[PDB]
């Protein structure tokens, strides 16, 4: 659809800082997953002389 | 050859049981997957048994027996945990249960003397054990099996019949 000056505050507007926040969150989750993968890989490289039982990622 | 005889004996017990049409249901060991009995070779175990630990040994009757009891401590699905007690048999009239008599002493400080007291403890008796009145039994604690039963027999030491009833704290 299309003394003092009184107007309603707009909502659902995505300014600059919302973009930065979303990008930071995405990057944080990605690096978390990467660190977990690296830790699993190094632990698996260790234990060369013992068995292991973890859920193998499918796909 | 010894293992072969065992498997045949176990196999018969399963097939003669299916001919007892009087029974409402077919009783089986939950661990064993029915279907192994269709294998002609003895490449699979047909009976399940465990060791209860605490230094007690599994009777040969349970290992070589042909009975089903889900409440047995050796072939069933219960675990022993807690207190181990001893007593003498008081009555053996139920299907797979008995009553155990325990004796102890109670001290009275005013008179500086004792009293002889006894309690009755009900337990489950697996078919691997044979018990008459007066024998000494060892019972282990388990989860509630019924309204009054929280113990299971683990060891039986026969006593001669006609022997004198005597106060025997244990």
């Amino acid at each position: 659809l299309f003394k003092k000056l009184k107007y309603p505050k707009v909502q659902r507007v995505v300014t600059d800082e919302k973009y930065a926040r979303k990008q930071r969150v995405i990057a944080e989750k990605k690096e978390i997953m990467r660190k977990s993968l690296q830790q699993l890989e190094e632990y698996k490289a260790l234990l060369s002389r013992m068995g292991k039982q973890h859920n193998i990622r499918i796909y | 050859r010894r293992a072969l005889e065992r498997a045949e004996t176990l196999r018969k017990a399963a097939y003669e049981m299916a001919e007892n049409q009087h029974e409402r249901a077919y009783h089986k060991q939950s661990q064993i997957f029915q279907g192994r009995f269709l294998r002609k070779d003895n490449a699979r175990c047909l009976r399940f048994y465990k060791s209860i630990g605490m230094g007690y040994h599994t009777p040969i009757t349970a290992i070589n027996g042909t009975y089903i009891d889900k409440k047995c401590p050796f072939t069933g699905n219960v675990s022993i945990r807690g207190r181990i007690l001893r007593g003498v048999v008081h009555s053996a009239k139920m299907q797979r249960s008995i009553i155990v008599r325990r004796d102890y002493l109670h001290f009275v400080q005013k008179y500086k003397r004792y009293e002889r007291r006894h309690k009755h403890v009900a337990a489950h008796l697996s078919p691997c054990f044979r018990v008459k009145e007066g024998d000494i039994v060892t019972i282990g604690e388990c989860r509630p099996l019924s309204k009054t039963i929280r113990f299971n027999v683990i060891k039986v030491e026969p006593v001669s019949e006609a022997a004198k009833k005597r106060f025997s704290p244990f």
């Binding site: - | 299916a18 077919y26 279907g35 269709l38």
Partner: protein
């Protein structure tokens, strides 16, 4: 309402015990689901809010389930036809009520679709050539909302066959 408290029972000697408190919500009970085979119609399952916020679902009507042939390792999803035996009561069988341990007849189409020729257990192949296969229920409807099981064989198959043959 419904309770499983032991305070309303007699003692081991047969005496009556006194009531020393009112009813508590720890020891409550609920009416049975009485899951019914289908044979405004469709699968219906309800959810129950249990203690601690946990979720429990009881099936009121269902028609399908997963059944596994252990010997050959063949598992498919099949339609349940009707109940034929129950070790607790004949009334459950007449009403076609599903519970753990019920013996049911399932359609043979999924299993005859393949391996109808492969030399497996002969007693099952003859059933496959027909229209129904004897099976058993292993899950608990009324707690998980499913009716799964396995195909019978071995001594139990002979037992149930002899049981339900003369009828």
């Amino acid at each position: 309402g419904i309770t499983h408290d032991k305070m309303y029972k007699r003692s081991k000697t047969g005496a009556v015990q006194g009531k020393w408190h009112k009813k508590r919500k720890y020891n409550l009970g609920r009416q049975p689901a009485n899951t019914k085979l289908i044979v405004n119609e469709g699968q219906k399952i309800s959810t129950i809010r249990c203690r601690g916020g946990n979720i429990k679902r009881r099936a009121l009507r269902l028609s399908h389930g997963s059944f596994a042939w252990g010997s050959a390792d063949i598992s498919h999803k099949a339609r349940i036809l009707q109940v034929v035996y129950n070790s607790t009561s004949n009334e459950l069988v007449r009403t076609n009520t599903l519970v753990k341990g019920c013996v049911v007849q399932i359609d043979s189409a999924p299993f005859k679709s393949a391996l109808s020729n492969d030399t497996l257990d002969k007693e099952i192949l003859d059933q496959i050539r027909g229209d129904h296969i004897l099976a058993r229920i292993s899950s608990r409807p009324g707690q998980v909302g499913t009716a799964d099981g396995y195909i019978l064989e071995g001594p139990e198959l002979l037992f149930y066959q002899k049981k339900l043959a003369p009828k």
